[PDB]
Amino acid sequence: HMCLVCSDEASGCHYGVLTCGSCKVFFKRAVEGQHNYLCAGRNDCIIDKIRRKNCPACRYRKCLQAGMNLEARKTKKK
Amino acid sequence: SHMCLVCSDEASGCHYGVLTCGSCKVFFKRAVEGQHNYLCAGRNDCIIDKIRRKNCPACRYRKCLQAGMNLEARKTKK
DNA sequence: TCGGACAAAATGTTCT
DNA sequence: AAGAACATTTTGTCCG
Ligand SMILES: [Zn+2]
Ligand SMILES: [Zn+2]
Ligand SMILES: [Zn+2]
Ligand SMILES: [Zn+2]
């Protein structure tokens, strides 16, 4: 299937969302680093397999908007 | 006479013909030496500043060329 | 699914 | 100034 963030091949539902392993780990690192990324464009960068490295701000924004959340399994269990 | 012409960080000298910081110097060398088949995720006018210069190597390399960076600056100069 | 360990890629600094 | 070595950061895969 397809990662909902970067369109690469997805490796499961991570943190609530069908995503590839690279996006899974990017997301956990972003949340736990509480990094404050800034876009160099217009907050609408193309995030695909090549370009996902280019804008961590837009990649992270796509993660969050797709509904990724570290407590996804904890919420869904409930 | 103080600022990197590519990213606006503090320049360290006049490298490959242009006033630049050390990071832009070696970024340009690596880009020319090798391949630079970079892809912009924006509209080819990414802002290249001290933080964001890492986001888009395509626009960073474009700004190096536009500023006139070239490997044989010192030969050409002589 | 999740995350630790390891590895690769990409970037940046020292040069006593 | 330019470049090799060294070093760090950022990203991605392998395992369990
Ligand atoms: Zn992805
Ligand atoms: Zn962006
Ligand atoms: Zn610079
Ligand atoms: Zn760009």
Side-chain angles (χ1 to χ4, degrees), chain A residues 5 44-48 50-52 54-55 58 62, chain B residues 40-42:
Chain A
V5 179
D44 199 5
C45 294
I46 296 163
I47 301 295
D48 58 29
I50 318 123
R51 292 178 272 200
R52 59 183 189 213
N54 286 13
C55 191
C58 284
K62 285 177 185 292
Chain B
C40 187

Side-chain angles (χ1 to χ4, degrees), chain A residues 3-9 19-24 52 59:
Chain A
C3 176
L4 282 165
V5 179
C6 76
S7 295
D8 208 358
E9 150 122 312
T19 40
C20 70
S22 82
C23 286
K24 166 206 79 180
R52 59 183 189 213
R59 185 177 189 182

Side-chain angles (χ1 to χ4, degrees), chain B residues 11-29:
Chain B
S12 61
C14 185
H15 305 295
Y16 303 122
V18 175
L19 199 54
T20 66
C21 61
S23 76
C24 288
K25 170 194 86 92
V26 66
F27 171 87
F28 178 74
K29 180 60 178 304

Side-chain angles (χ1 to χ4, degrees), chain A residues 1-75 77-78:
Chain A
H1 307 59
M2 211 175 64
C3 176
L4 282 165
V5 179
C6 76
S7 295
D8 208 358
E9 150 122 312
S11 70
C13 225
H14 305 285
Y15 304 128
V17 180
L18 184 54
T19 40
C20 70
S22 82
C23 286
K24 166 206 79 180
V25 70
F26 175 83
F27 182 70
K28 184 144 173 293
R29 288 167 173 157
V31 175
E32 281 182 348
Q34 285 148 269
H35 306 130
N36 283 294
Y37 296 130
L38 175 70
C39 183
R42 296 166 172 69
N43 275 160
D44 199 5
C45 294
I46 296 163
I47 301 295
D48 58 29
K49 179 190 184 68
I50 318 123
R51 292 178 272 200
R52 59 183 189 213
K53 296 197 187 177
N54 286 13
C55 191
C58 284
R59 185 177 189 182
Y60 185 38
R61 177 178 53 67
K62 285 177 185 292
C63 287
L64 290 168
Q65 294 181 329
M68 293 190 72
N69 169 71
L70 293 186
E71 281 84 15
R73 207 164 198 189
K74 158 202 288 296
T75 281
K77 182 69 179 295
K78 267 196 166 267

Side-chain angles (χ1 to χ4, degrees), chain B residues 48-59:
Chain B
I48 301 304
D49 65 10
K50 169 154 167 73
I51 7 122
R52 289 180 291 187
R53 63 191 182 202
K54 301 186 185 193
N55 283 197
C56 187
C59 288

